[PDB]
Design a protein around this ligand. Structure first.
Ligand SMILES: Cc1cccc(-c2ccc(-c3cc4cnccc4n(CCOCCN(C)C)c3=O)c(Cl)c2)n1
Ligand SMILES: Cc1cccc(-c2ccc(-c3cc4cnccc4n(CCOCCN(C)C)c3=O)c(Cl)c2)n1
Lengths: 281, 298
């Protein structure tokens, strides 16, 4: 009844058309579709709630997401109960992910600065509401066809379990399993800016346990070609990748950094989107 | 590139319908590696475990290739047997024999094992490792979580996703692969290593059977790596509680000098194993572990 006071009434099978499956997350199945009245493209996650545990957690997470929108977060539109399934409808960003741009183009520092600024705007908002994203990385940055930049995926593994993937975006204080705060996202942003300029995530050729150790002890990964970065970009990276949590910049502080002032207009990202789409098809 | 590693995986798996051969699919688990069911062979009544995976969503497909190939190529009564596999569109289904007695982890965390029961488990595990090492396969992820038990007390090794195949041209590995608390010091410190890293991990599993946990489990995984590198052979909480023969077996599994550490073939002759009880002795422990699991859930 809290879900019924959270969802909308109506038939989403009538409001939307052209359903196309993308894939299946842990939550549920994800489709793209189009609003029959406005032509807006949407992404719809269908979740069988009969039954997933911590259902109230999904209800509350969706609750919070509906009341705290922001231009740099993928916009929540509506939810519907469709026969024991819960459908969550989000706006659809058709420009793909930042990962595709990073791997198929070489971004210049003005383009990187523009992405960093848009992400830092999102993080300032999240941190002001005491939200920690924890997975700031390129596959969680979605791009609009106008060059808009938005965060997604801000929604647990045993000591006894082996590590299969490398958590290359995680701050040293996360990796050493300490308590931590919003500035882990700033660290992750620094790592993503290195990814943008090098074209691949750091530690790519490392086993996860070796990378875990390097993160805890070295902190920043060694830039492959540091001579290739401008002084102001290198300074920005140093402020994001400070091992001392107190010294590491906050999002509010870094929004004032001079590196962000070389940002190109966001229209400068749309040729990157075009290249990535040509390259991946 | 990555489309041809996918095609390589698809090529090793036959296309067909798992319902042609198996029925009564009951979910028993869901995870990152896919979804796990029990099912039954329609013709023979054999109970099986079946994992369903979405290939397009799996990273490191080459590790799935290696796991399937190693299972197919190395069947043994002390290994959870690979039966079959099926390609259904984007889906891969892998069929394994089913062991209904849970894991050794449930036993070690909820029961006290006596030395005869411990010796029985060690012997069965050493039989698997002697077979694998003689086939130039290193498991590298031995731990109680990867020991499955049958309802008759049978003992079988699983989880070959981290295993390494060695050759006479490249007899050793040096990469940090495994689960920290069970890793041998030469692995943790990136020295050239061989099959006896599995003997080390078995020694750690014997400490689990003694104490309930591997050394340093309360520490974070990275700290445990540091402690393994710096301490070497771990200390028992109460060594005075073990027989002299058990202590000697443990010493020979946890030897720092890899040349002095026992091989699986050598340890199968150790006098500690001569006190092993029959495997039937493990079914009361399985029953206790099953009951304890109900207590923790209620
Ligand atoms: C349970 C719950 C509670 C709250 C929110 C969501 C939820 C939030 C984001 C989305 C989403 C929006 C999207 C917009 N435009 C392009 C692709 C998109 N995609 C697929 C690609 O996602 C990229 C990140 N990663 C998976 C690779 C999405 O999933 C959805 Cl459908 C659901 N869900
Ligand atoms: C991709 C690939 C390639 C090759 C083999 C496998 C694979 C190997 C083991 C199994 C498996 C067999 C099993 C038998 N009897 C009881 C429970 C079982 N279970 C669940 C209990 O978990 C096991 C412990 N482990 C997860 C920590 C299993 O998973 C499966 Cl289905 C698949 N997979």
């Amino acid at each position: 009844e809290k879900l019924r006071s959270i969802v909308s009434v109506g038939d989403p099978k009538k409001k939307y058309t052209r359903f196309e499956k993308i894939g299946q997350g842990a939550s549920g199945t994800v489709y793209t579709a189009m609003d029959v009245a406005t032509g807006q493209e949407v992404a719809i996650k269908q979740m069988n709630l009969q039954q997933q545990p911590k259902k109230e957690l999904i209800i509350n997470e969706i609750l919070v997401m509906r009341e705290n929108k922001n231009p740099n977060i993928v916009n929540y539109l509506d939810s519907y109960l469709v026969g024991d399934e819960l459908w969550v409808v989000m706006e659809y960003l058709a420009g793909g992910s930042l990962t595709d741009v990073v791997t198929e183009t070489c971004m210049d520092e003005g383009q990187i600065a523009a992405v960093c600024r848009e992400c830092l705007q999102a993080l300032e908002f999240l941190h002001s509401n005491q939200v920690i994203h924890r997975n700031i990385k390129s596959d969680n940055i979605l791009l609009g066809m106008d060059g808009s930049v938005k965060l997604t995926d801000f929604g647990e593994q045993s000591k006894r379990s082996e590590m299969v993937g490398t958590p290359y975006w995680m701050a040293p204080e996360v990796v050493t399993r300490k308590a931590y705060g919003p500035k882990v996202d700033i660290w992750s942003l620094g790592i993503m800016a290195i990814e943008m300029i090098e074209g691949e995530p750091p530690y790519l050729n490392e086993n996860p346990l070796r990378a875990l150790y390097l993160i805890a002890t070295n902190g920043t990964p060694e830039l492959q070609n540091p001579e290739k970065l401008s002084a102001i970009f290198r300074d920005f990276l140093n402020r994001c990748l400070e091992m001392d949590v107190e010294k590491r910049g906050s999002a509010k502080e870094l929004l004032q950094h001079q590196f962000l002032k070389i940002a190109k207009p966001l229209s400068s990202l749309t040729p990157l989107i075009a290249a990535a789409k040509e390259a991946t098809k």
